[PDB]
Enzyme design. Sequence first.
Site, PDB file in Angstrom:
ATOM      1  CB  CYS A  65      -2.404   3.088   8.654  1.00 26.35           C
ATOM      2  SG  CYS A  65      -4.118   3.589   8.377  1.00 26.35           S
TER       3      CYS A  65
ATOM      4  CE  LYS B   1      -2.532   7.427  -0.796  1.00 32.03           C
ATOM      5  NZ  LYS B   1      -3.708   8.316  -0.589  1.00 32.03           N
TER       6      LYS B   1
ATOM      7  CB  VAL C 154      -4.594   1.332   3.762  1.00 33.20           C
ATOM      8  CG1 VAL C 154      -3.851   1.127   2.446  1.00 33.20           C
ATOM      9  CG2 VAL C 154      -3.794   2.229   4.709  1.00 33.20           C
TER      10      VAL C 154
ATOM     11  CD  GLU D 132     -15.056   4.327   4.153  1.00 33.94           C
ATOM     12  OE1 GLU D 132     -15.319   5.169   5.041  1.00 33.94           O
ATOM     13  OE2 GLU D 132     -14.281   4.544   3.197  1.00 33.94           O
ATOM     14  CB  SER D 133     -11.149   1.030   9.501  1.00 38.04           C
ATOM     15  OG  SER D 133     -11.797   2.148  10.080  1.00 38.04           O
TER      16      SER D 133
END
Lengths: 235, 235
Positions: free
Chosen positions: A28, A55, A68, A81-82
């Site tokens: 990811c 999941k 993720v 939220e990255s």
Amino acid sequence: SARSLGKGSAPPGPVPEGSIRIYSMRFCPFAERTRLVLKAKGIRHEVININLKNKPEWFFKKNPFGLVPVLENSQGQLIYESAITCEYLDEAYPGKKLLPDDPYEKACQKMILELFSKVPSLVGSFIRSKEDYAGLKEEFRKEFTKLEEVLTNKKTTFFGGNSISMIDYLIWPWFERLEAMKLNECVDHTPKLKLWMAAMKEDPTVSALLTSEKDWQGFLELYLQNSPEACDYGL
Amino acid sequence: ESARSLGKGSAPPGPVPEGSIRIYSMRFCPFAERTRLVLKAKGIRHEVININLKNKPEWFFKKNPFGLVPVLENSQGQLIYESAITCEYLDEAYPGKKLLPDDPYEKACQKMILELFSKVPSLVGSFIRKEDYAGLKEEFRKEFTKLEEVLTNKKTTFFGGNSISMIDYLIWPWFERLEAMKLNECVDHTPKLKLWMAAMKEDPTVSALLTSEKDWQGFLELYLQNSPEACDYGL
């Protein structure tokens, strides 16, 4: 220990004192942002990989969006939220700051992140589906010229100065996959951006988290086959 | 009159004076109202230059490569755009009471709540732009339920605690336009969000910047017909 957790798996235990947990997926690029920050800041952590095609039922209580990366600390606090996870880690942990403390310089990094906003969707579109390739490579070239202009105007090697900082780590995961996708010709008209990619690969943090182009192609062919083993390619 | 919007053929503005900051805005723009709520709350010395969004000056495209308001400009010639970025810059760059909590996790919660709110500005735009009404009103109810769940869990009047903070000012402009759009029924199943709306209207900063239902409908009638006088309605 790296095998992804999926549907039917048992909810994980509490995060131990002095450590942080990241709910991630090895291929990811959004989660890779958070892991670059975790490595650059020398933060003690544990990784839990999530099977994004199957999941775990307990994962939706970690993030209402079901995506993720997700951070979880010993107090049970959850951060998703990255970009938010990266900002939180730089703020909550000691050592050298990845974000500049000057308010204008920090605002520039967030404005550059917005200039990059079309790149993840183009990568997604390219991976999926062909006669579409020509149009998509042209789209990539136009977006990359915008980043070329930032480096030209800044007169620096990196997006936030003459040394690596948060902004570089936030956009790196998509340039990493560019070569694996055999789209390197899309930077043939952006020389400063090309020199930036070479400088990034020489950074110890970037280098330690690179995925080999064969592991990425192994993941992708399994992903494109709709296999629930994709996330666990290469074990 | 310094308030009338600048259009094609207007002269580019002079330098921003020392000790001041300029905001490029539009009096009926909810994204720029965020920035103006922050300048008022923090007591920041500034000047406003309104942009005719239906007759944009050529010289304005050099202030923001996206061509949107709000834009901040200081005496050093620095340019800051994206409404959320302009608000965070003002909170860090100027003295007084901070609108953002100092705790890294509390700061992250404000950015996560803003993400939960992200579909509301585009539903407002789609509503203003039938039969479509019934569906759009149902979408508003679903989004407002998400915000009511936040308030229910926090057990506080405001989204960041017992006192008004940055997150409240960031989402307020769209709740301000509900009565005007006759959409008050979309919050009749959300009692905590309804009490928050009443609490917001009591805030001196919010109250000082409210647009009358008449000025708003007067702007809208002209804007929907692409009138160059729309932005200057009510003088």
